[PDB]
Design a protein around this ligand. Structure first.
Ligand SMILES: [Zn+2]
Ligand SMILES: [Zn+2]
Ligand SMILES: [Zn+2]
Ligand SMILES: [Zn+2]
Lengths: 149, 99, 101
């Protein structure tokens, strides 16, 4: 089909003319279906100052199926586990074929600012986030300095 | 990929058949996808439940139910017709001062 | 509500420009308006959601509806089926006017 590859290449073109704020993404080599991304920790969060890397794999029928996206940088967050797995609706049940990697990245940045403790990958962290915000920020910043800086 | 086109070549695509002018507040009948100025179609639908162009029935009993603001169309019109947007805006100020 | 404002109940037409005026259409002038949200290419065989008036290539929206998810890919409104969409020849015509293909 080559249809997915066309869609992917255009997104890459747009990203070149309009680099998204605080993040970047592109092929990790010669295969347009395998990308890497980097997200800077939002300043409106305990992840501020951190650089977080992600891995991206587009399915052959992208964009009618969501891309597969995960963190490779360890992070302390209710919706992200130690495998870098991300609990985000648009990545699974709420995917739309109108979506782009640019939008996914901005969605994830938003997730970093405002975790969704009600749909946790790590209950222990969702807990702390709901009951003791200062404890959450404290540990979150420590991990950022330790692993993401 | 920049192209220049005679405005009279675009006009057919940008004009309401009811008033003979450019679309203002473009509104589209969802039944057939024919478009009009908001005011032109809302007034017209007060005494007809059939499209002015294709004569299909807009709704059994309430035509308004089946029309929508067409932001995409209006944005196209405002971006192509030079001055149109400012003029319509001025037209509204000059009126809201007077009333 | 479709109630007409005081300005609206009286508004007069915006007369057409009928002189040799040329419109300069630069590559982005109509980028958002003429692009299919799904394939990111210029709209082809435009089909348009009846509920929310959002436009897609016929093949693109049909494929997306076959790929399970019954929403407008643009705003999430319920789409039962192909019959919730309508072909938009007029939109195609404007596109062919500006960019013959
Ligand atoms: Zn009109
Ligand atoms: Zn009609
Ligand atoms: Zn829609
Ligand atoms: Zn398309």
């Amino acid at each position: 089909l080559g249809s997915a590859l066309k869609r992917i290449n255009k997104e890459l073109s747009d990203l070149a003319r309009d680099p998204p704020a605080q993040c970047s993404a592109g092929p990790v080599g010669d295969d347009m279906f395998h990308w890497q991304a980097t997200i800077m920790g939002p300043n409106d969060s305990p992840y501020q100052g951190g650089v977080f890397f992600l891995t991206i794999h587009f399915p052959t029928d992208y964009p009618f199926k969501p891309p597969k996206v995960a963190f490779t940088t360890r992070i302390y967050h209710p919706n992200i586990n130690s495998n870098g797995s991300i609990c985000l609706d648009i990545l699974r049940s709420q995917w739309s074929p109108a979506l782009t990697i640019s939008k996914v990245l901005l969605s994830i940045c938003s997730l970093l600012c405002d975790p969704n403790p009600d749909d946790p990958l790590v209950p222990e962290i969702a807990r702390i986030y709901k009951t003791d915000r200062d404890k959450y920020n404290r540990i979150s910043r420590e991990w950022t300095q330790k692993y993401a800086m | 990929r920049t192209t220049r086109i005679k405005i009279t070549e675009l006009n057919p695509h940008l004009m309401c058949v009811l008033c003979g002018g450019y679309f203002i507040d473009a509104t589209t009948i969802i039944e057939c996808l024919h478009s009009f100025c908001k005011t032109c179609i809302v007034r017209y639908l007060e005494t007809s439940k059939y499209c002015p162009i294709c004569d299909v029935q807009v709704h059994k009993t309430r035509p308004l139910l089946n029309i929508r603001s067409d932001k995409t169309l209006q944005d196209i019109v405002y971006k192509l017709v030079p001055g149109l947007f400012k003029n319509e805006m001025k037209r509204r100020r000059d009126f809201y001062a007077a009333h | 509500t479709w109630e007409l404002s005081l300005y609206e109940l009286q508004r007069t037409p915006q007369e057409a420009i009928t002189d040799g005026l040329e419109i300069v259409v630069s590559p982005r002038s109509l980028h958002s308006e003429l692009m299919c949200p799904i394939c990111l290419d210029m709209l082809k065989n435009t089909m348009t959601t009846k509920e929310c008036l959002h436009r897609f290539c016929a093949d693109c929206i049909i494929t997306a509806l076959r790929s399970g998810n019954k929403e407008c890919p643009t705003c999430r409104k319920k789409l039962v089926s192909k019959r919730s969409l309508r072909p938009d020849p007029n939109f195609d015509a404007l596109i062919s006017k500006i960019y013959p293909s």
